[PDB]
């Protein structure tokens, strides 16, 4: 995030980090329940990647994080890589996350929910702060 | 070089019609734009959440998808519109 700010540790409990086996963060995701994570289809997640929950500082060794293995990757069949439309993938976890003060789920909207232009919302992540 | 610590940013949602002024016909119905406000999602933020508080609860409105190749803060980022994809999520969870 360019021009963002550091978040209060643990205040976005559904935020997970997708890291490859070498420990490299390549994408974010959100916990929708103990066994499922929603992310973008273009992230190209495989069953060899890891879902890290409860993390705040990726350079810290004292955070009690949860490294969850991925059982199955569900890429939406309507995903169109040419136009990047329907960019969503669901990951079913092999080991269920343990909900706590720093790990919990975000709500899903009803299909008919309206979110008006002008509404101020929030986005989070460990993406580049400067390009 | 992604930051070590989790970052956050508040930003406004845009309408698809207005977003087309920026991205033309690349904007489809299963997409929702946000930003162009001085902040911007960027490489490594992909897959992450765009949440809006509705009736006191944080609700997933978008998934970081694509945007400016330079993460321009005056250009809106494009997110997968969750309302258009939630029926599929619900079906997938109910069948597996």
């Amino acid at each position: 995030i360019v021009n963002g700010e550091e978040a209060v540790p643990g205040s976005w409990p559904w935020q997970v980090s997708l890291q490859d086996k070498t420990g490299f963060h390549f994408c974010g995701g959100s916990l929708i329940n103990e066994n499922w994570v929603v992310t973008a289809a273009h992230c190209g997640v495989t069953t060899s990647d890891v879902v890290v929950a409860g993390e705040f500082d990726q350079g810290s060794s004292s955070e009690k994080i949860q490294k969850l293995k991925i059982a199955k990757v569900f890429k939406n069949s309507k995903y169109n890589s040419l136009t990047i439309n329907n960019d969503i993938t669901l990951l079913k976890l092999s080991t269920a996350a343990s909900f706590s003060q720093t790990v919990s789920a975000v709500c899903l909207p009803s299909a008919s929910d309206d979110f008006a232009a002008g509404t101020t919302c929030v986005t989070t992540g460990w993406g580049l702060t400067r390009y | 070089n992604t930051p070590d610590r989790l970052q956050q940013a508040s930003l406004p949602l845009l309408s698809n019609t207005n977003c087309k002024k920026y991205w033309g016909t690349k904007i489809k119905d299963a997409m929702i734009c946000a930003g162009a406000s001085g902040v911007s999602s960027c490489m490594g933020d992909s897959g992450g959440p765009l949440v809006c508080k509705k009736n006191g609860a944080w609700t997933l409105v978008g998934i970081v998808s694509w945007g400016s190749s330079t993460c321009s803060t005056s250009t809106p980022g494009v997110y997968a519109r969750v309302t258009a994809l939630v029926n599929w999520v619900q079906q997938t969870l109910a069948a597996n």
């Binding site: 209060v8 540790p9 205040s11 409990p13 720093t102 | 609860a57």
Partner: peptide
């Protein structure tokens, strides 16, 4: 869902 135990400060 959607109610953090640790409140975000914006």
């Amino acid at each position: 869902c959607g109610v953090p135990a640790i409140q975000p400060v914006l």
